[PDB]
Specification:
thymidylate synthase activity (chain A), binds NADPH dihydro-nicotinamide-adenine-dinucleotide phosphate, 20 strands, Thymidate_synth/dCMP_Mease_sf (chain A), binds 2'-deoxyuridine 5'-monophosphate, homodimer, alpha/beta, 3 domains, about 550 residues, Dihydrofolate Reductase, subunit A, binds methotrexate, Single alpha-helices involved in coiled-coils or other helix-helix interfaces, Thymidylate Synthase, Chain A, nucleotide-binding (chain A), multifunctional enzyme (chain A), oxidoreductase (chain A)
C-alpha cells in the first residue's frame, strides 16, 4: 500500500473538450472514440467562446467542499508527511496562459486558492491573491503546508500533459462539448489502461450545443437503519432465472459504471432487465423471445434528440415513413421507390395471403397508420383511392386541440382501429399518442403494445421524438418530453449476442434535430426540412449476426 | 450524555398479532386502528397455528448480526456500565409458557443466546447452553456480562406487558396478520405519543392470509459520494409549489424511512403532483395540479390493492363492470340499482352541452359496453338489439388468452375514434392489454385522464377485479395489474383531504374472493364478489365543503 501522491493530496483534473475541425478531411465514414473529444483552446481562448452550463459545472465542482470529510483528509496527509495536530477551500492549479485568458472580473477564481505555474512571471508580476510556482514539485510542497479539501488542475494543455505523464491525476472530470470548433491545443490522448470511465451524466443543451459530463478514474494496475433495510429484504431470491444463462461477467463495462445518468441507459437498462429477469416465450414469428410487461422511458427533447449512440442508426428511412404516415399513404411502393424497405416483407404476396388478404394487391398494406391518422372509420378500398373528407382526420383534430384547447385531456391520436385490424398487413405496434401542453411546451406519450428492443425500439424513439418536434412547431410550442410506454417488451433470442456487445458501449452525448422553421402546417414537411447535427455513435451492429 | 437502558442494551420486541373474534359483540361500521392487530396466543399456541413467512421473518431478524457494527455497541455499553471489558449472536428473551410452546425439534433456537424468565424453574430443569433468570432486572445484569449484538423480546403476552410497562423496549418489530382467529392472550395497546411507526414493508400472502411487517420506534423526551453532488449541480433551490404545499404538513409521510407498502405507489404520485405539479385550468374554471406519464404495478398474487388510507366501497364499481360486460349503454339500468357513477353524464343539460340533442336522457351512446361487445356497429339507441353486430373484442381477447397466450395483440380498446362525438364522454380508460406467462395473467390499463383524489382509487379496484375475472374464466392465476397514467391531476379542492391521507400509514391489503364456479365472463353476478379482511382508515370526503 505504498500510497500514491494524487491519493494523499486528492489531485483531480477537470477539463472541457469539443470536437476538432477535421485533420482527416470530410465526414462520410467517420470513426468515433473518446479521442473525438479533445479540443481545449484556440488562439489563447476557448474554441466555443461561452458555455454557460459547463462554466456552472466547473464552478460547482471546483468550489464544493465537505467540511465533515476534512478530518480524514488532514490525518491521512499528516501520517504521509509524519505530523501531529477559516472556511475550507479547494485549490485550483492553472498554467500562466490559462490564468491570462480568465476575464479580470472573475480573477482570482472566487472561494478557491488559486495556484499559477509560470517561469516567465514571479509573485511580483501579479497584483492578485495567488500562489506562483515555477515547477510541479513546488505544488506537492505547497499542498503539504495548506489546509484545503481537494486540488483541481484546471488546464491548460501543457499543464494537463505534465500532470498525466507524472501519474498525478486521481480522476478526470471531463466535459464532452458535442460540436466542432477551430482548435490549436488538445487534451492528451487518455490511455485506456491508465484510466477508465466510471460515470456519465445526463445530456444537456447550452449555447446551441449538447454536452455531457463524464468521470475517468485511475485504474488499479444511524447503524440500526441499515439493519431495518436488511430485514425488509428477508424474502428475496438467491438467483435471477437467466442470470446463470446470461453471465454478468459478459457486462464488465456496463457493470463497472457507478453513475449511469445518460438517458440512453433507460433503453440499455430495460435490455439488461429483460436479459436477467425476462420470461422465455414463443411468439407469432417462431424466433422465441425473452419478455417482460410494462416499462416507461422519458426523454427531454428541449435538452437533446435521443438517437441511440451505442450503435449506428440512419434516420432517412424513418423520416420518410413518418412523412408517408402524415400524407395518409398505405402504398408500400412509394417507400420502396425511395429505397425504404421497412414494410417490404409485410406487403409480399406470401405475407398478404398468410394474413388471408387474398384480394389485396402486393404492397397494399391496407388501413394502417396513415389511413387511421387521416381517415379513421372510412371503409378502406385500395391504396390508390382518394378518401377525400371520409372518416375522421384525427391528425388535423389534435393540431386544432393543441392550438385552441391546450388543457384538453382528450388530445389522442389512435391507430388501433378494432374494426380494421384484420384488413391491415400488421396491426399497429404504436397504439396511441397522447399530448400534454403546459406553459408553451408540448409533451407526448406513445403507448407501444409490442416492442422489439434490439431493432424496433431505437427507430421508434426517434420517430415519435421527431413527430413531437413537428407537432410542437406547427402549433407554435416548444417540445418538452417524449414519454415511451412499453407493453410487451421483448428481446429476440437472435439479438442476445449483439445486444451484449451494445450494452458494454458507453453512450456519447446525443445529437440535436433542426427543423426548417418556415413550415407552419403538418402536411408541408419534406425530407430536406430535417437536419441531425453532431451525431457521434459507435459502429453499426447487425442484430441478426447470421451469414 | 442522556442515554436510556433500552438504547444502551438495544432491547427490541418482535411479535406477530392477528385480529380478534368478537364472540357475539360489535361489528356495525367497524372502526380500525393499530390496536386492531393484538392477537398473540390461544390455548398456549399461536392463534393462526402456522405462518411460514412470519416464521421466516422471525428467524432472519433474530438470527442477523453485523460484526463490523458491534465495536461501537461494545464501546457504548461499557461507558454506561463503568467497565471496559467466539462468533457474535443476538439474545432471545422468552417467558416459560413461550419456551414450552416451541417444538423440541427447534429449541434451543438455533444460533441465538436463549434466555427464559421463570419464577418456578432454575438452570437444573434445563442446561448451560440456555440461561434462566428470576426477574426482569436479572437480564440487564446478564446483558452487561455477554458478547451479544441485539437483544430480542419474543413474548409471550405477560413478558411483553411488563417489558413495555417498565419502558425497556427501543423498537417493536410487529407482524400484522390480516385475518381473524380465536385468541385468549393479547399484545398491549401501544400509545401513539410514546411509540411511532417508522417503516412499513411490502404486503404478502402466506397460509391464505395477507400480512405485512411494520417497525415502531420509541419517541424521544467515502468520496464517490461527492461525484453524486457534482451530477446534481443543475438542480433547483426548491420544488415548485413547496411554499404553496408546505412539506411540514407531511410530517408522518416524511418521518418514514422505508415505505415499501404498495399503497405508497399511489400516495407517492399524489406527493409528486403536489410538490412538482403544473398549475392549470381544465374543462371548467376548477384548479388542478397536473403531471404527464406514471406507472403503478400491483401484485394481485399477494394482495387486492383496495386503498386503506381511506374507506372505499365496491358495489357500484362491480355493477359498472357487469354492465360493461353485458354490452349495456343504458344508464337507467345503473340508476335503478342506485349506481350513480354516470348520472351527471346522462342529464338533458350534459347531453345538450355535448351537442347530443337527439339523445335520450341516460342514453350514454356507444361507450365501453358497446365497444367491448360491438366495436364498429352503428349505434342507434340504448334499447336496440345489436346481437352479432360489430367486433365482440371481449370474446376475442378471451379466446386469444386461451388459444394464443403469447400473442402480443391481446388488447381491449374503448377509444373508438369514429364514435367519440356520439359518446356522453370519451373513455378515460383507453385500453387493456393482457400478458400471459407460466399460467399467470397480467393486465396493463392505459388511462388518458386520472383524477387522483377521487377517480384513481376506484379505477385501481375496477381493473384489478376485471383482471381476476378474465384470469378465472381462462384458468389462469392473476399476476400484476399495471396502471399507466397519462394526464394525472389533483383537483385543488382535494389538496387538504389528500394531505390528511398522505399522513396515514397503510394497513395490510384485503383479498378478493370470486365464486370459483363462474367460468364464463358473462355469468358473474354481484354475489360472486367478496372483499375479505378490509382494514381501513376513516372515510375522507375528498371535497371538504359544508
Ligand atoms: N477547455 C478547457 O478545459 C481549458 C481550456 N484552456 C485553453 O487552453 C489554452 C491554454 O493552454 P496552453 O497554451 O497549453 O497553456 P497553459 O495554460 O498550459 O500554460 C502554459 C504555461 O504554463 C507555465 N507552466 C506550465 N507548466 C509549468 C511548469 N511545470 N513549471 C513552470 N511553468 C509551467 C508556463 O508559463 P510561462 O510561459 O509564463 O513560464 C507555460 O508557458 C487556451 O486556449 C485556453 O483558453 C485552458 C484551460 C482549460
Ligand atoms: N404471536 C406471537 O408473537 C407470540 C405468541 N406467543 C403465544 O402467547 C402465549 C404465551 O404467552 P403467555 O401465556 O402470556 O406466556 P409468557 O411466555 O409470557 O410466559 C409468562 C411466564 O414467564 C415467567 N415470567 C413472566 N414474567 C416474569 C418475571 N417478571 N419474573 C420471572 N418470571 C417471569 C413466568 O413463568 P413461571 O410460571 O415458570 O415462573 C410466567 O408465568 C402462547 O399462546 C404462545 O403461543 C408467544 C410468544 C410470541
Ligand atoms: C481555465 N479556464 C478555462 C476553462 C473553461 N472552461 C472549463 N470547463 C471545464 N469543465 N474545465 C475547465 N478546466 C475549464 N477551463 C477558465 C476558468 C474559469 C473561468 C471563469 O471565469 N470562471 C468563473 C465562472 C464565472 C461565471 O461564468 O459564472 C468561476 O468563478 O469559476 C474562465 C476560464
Ligand atoms: C420501424 N421498423 C419496423 C419494425 C421494427 N422491428 C420489427 N421487428 C420485428 N420482429 N418485426 C417487424 N415487423 C418489425 N418492424 C423498422 C425500422 C428500421 C428497420 C431497419 O432499417 N433495420 C435495419 C437493421 C440493421 C442491422 O441490424 O443490421 C436494416 O438495415 O434493415 C426495420 C424495421
Ligand atoms: C416464541 N415463539 C412464538 C412466536 C411465533 N412466531 C412469532 N413471529 C413473530 N414475528 N414474532 C414472534 N415473537 C413470534 N413468536 C416461537 C419462536 C420460535 C419458533 C420456532 O420454532 N422457530 C424456529 C424455526 C421455525 C421454522 O422455521 O418453522 C427458529 O429457528 O426460529 C416457534 C415459536
Ligand atoms: O414500429 C415497430 C413495428 C414492429 N415492432 C415489432 C414488435 C414485434 O417484434 C413485431 C410485431 O409483431 P406482433 O407484436 O404484431 O406479433 O415488430 C416494433 O418494435 N416496432
Ligand atoms: O373512471 C374514471 C372517469 C373519470 N375520471 C376523471 C378524469 C377527469 O378528471 C374526468 C374526465 O374528464 P376529461 O378528462 O375527459 O375532461 O374524470 C377518472 O379518473 N376515472
Amino acid at each position: 500500500m505504498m500510497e500514491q501522491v494524487c491519493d494523499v493530496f486528492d489531485i483531480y483534473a477537470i477539463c472541457a473538450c469539443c470536437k476538432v475541425e477535421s485533420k482527416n478531411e470530410g465526414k462520410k465514414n467517420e470513426v468515433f472514440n473518446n479521442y473525438t473529444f479533445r479540443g481545449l483552446g484556440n488562439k489563447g481562448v476557448l474554441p466555443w467562446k461561452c458555455n454557460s452550463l459547463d462554466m456552472k459545472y466547473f464552478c460547482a465542482v471546483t468550489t464544493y467542499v465537505n467540511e465533515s470529510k476534512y478530518e480524514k483528509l488532514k490525518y491521512k496527509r499528516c501520517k504521509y508527511l509524519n505530523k501531529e495536530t477559516k472556511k475550507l477551500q479547494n485549490v485550483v492549479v492553472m498554467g500562466r496562459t490559462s490564468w491570462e485568458s480568465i476575464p479580470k472580473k472573475f480573477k482570482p477564481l472566487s472561494n478557491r486558492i488559486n495556484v499559477i505555474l509560470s517561469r516567465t512571471l514571479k509573485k511580483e508580476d501579479f497584483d492578485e491573491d495567488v500562489y506562483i510556482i515555477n515547477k510541479v514539485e513546488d505544488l506537492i510542497v505547497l499542498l503539504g503546508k495548506l489546509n484545503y479539501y481537494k486540488c483541481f488542475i484546471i488546464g491548460g494543455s501543457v499543464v494537463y500533459q505534465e500532470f498525466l505523464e507524472k501519474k498525478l491525476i486521481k480522476k478526470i472530470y471531463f466535459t464532452r462539448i458535442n460540436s466542432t470548433y477551430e482548435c490549436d491545443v488538445f487534451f492528451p490522448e487518455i490511455n485506456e489502461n491508465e484510466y477508465q470511465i466510471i460515470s456519465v451524466s445526463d445530456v444537456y443543451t447550452s449555447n446551441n450545443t449538447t454536452l455531457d459530463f463524464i468521470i475517468y478514474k485511475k485504474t488499479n494496475n444511524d447503524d440500526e437503519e441499515e439493519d431495518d433495510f436488511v430485514y425488509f429484504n428477508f424474502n428475496k431470491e438467491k438467483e435471477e432465472k437467466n442470470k446463470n444463462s446470461i453471465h454478468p461477467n459478459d457486462f464488465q463495462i456496463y457493470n463497472s459504471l457507478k453513475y449511469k445518468y445518460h438517458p440512453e441507459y433507460q433503453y440499455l437498462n430495460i435490455i439488461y432487465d429483460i436479459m436477467m429477469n425476462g420470461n422465455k416465450q414463443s411468439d407469432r414469428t417462431g424466433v422465441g423471445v425473452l419478455s417482460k410487461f410494462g416499462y416507461i422511458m422519458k426523454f427531454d427533447l428541449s435538452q437533446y434528440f435521443p438517437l441511440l449512440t451505442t450503435k449506428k442508426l440512419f434516420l432517412r428511412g424513418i423520416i420518410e415513413e413518418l412523412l408517408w404516415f402524415i400524407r395518409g399513404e398505405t402504398n408500400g411502393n412509394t417507400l420502396l421507390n425511395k429505397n425504404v424497405r421497412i414494410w417490404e416483407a409485410n406487403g409480399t404476396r406470401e405475407f398478404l395471403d398468410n394474413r388471408k388478404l387474398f384480394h389485396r394487391e402486393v404492397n397494399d398494406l391496407g388501413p394502417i397508420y396513415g389511413f387511421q391518422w387521416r381517415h379513421f372509420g372510412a371503409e378502406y378500398t385500395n391504396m390508390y383511392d382518394n378518401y377525400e373528407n371520409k372518416g375522421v382526420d384525427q391528425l388535423k383534430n389534435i393540431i386544432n386541440l393543441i392550438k385552441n384547447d391546450p388543457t384538453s385531456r382528450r388530445i389522442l391520436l389512435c391507430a388501433w382501429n378494432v374494426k380494421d385490424l384484420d384488413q391491415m398487413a400488421l396491426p399497429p405496434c404504436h397504439i396511441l399518442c397522447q399530448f400534454y401542453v403546459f406553459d408553451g411546451k408540448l409533451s407526448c406519450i406513445m403507448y407501444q403494445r409490442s416492442c422489439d428492443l434490439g431493432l424496433g425500439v431505437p427507430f421508434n424513439i426517434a420517430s415519435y421524438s421527431i413527430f413531437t418536434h413537428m407537432i410542437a412547431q406547427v402549433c407554435n410550442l416548444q417540445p418538452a418530453q417524449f414519454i415511451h410506454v412499453l407493453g410487451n417488451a421483448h428481446v429476440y433470442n437472435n439479438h442476445i449476442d449483439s445486444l451484449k456487445i451494445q450494452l458494454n458501449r458507453i453512450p456519447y452525448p446525443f445529437p440535436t434535430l433542426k427543423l426548417n422553421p418556415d413550415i407552419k402546417n403538418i402536411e408541408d414537411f419534406t425530407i430536406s426540412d430535417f437536419t441531425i447535427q453532431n451525431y457521434v455513435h459507435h459502429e453499426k451492429i447487425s442484430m441478426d449476426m447470421a451469414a
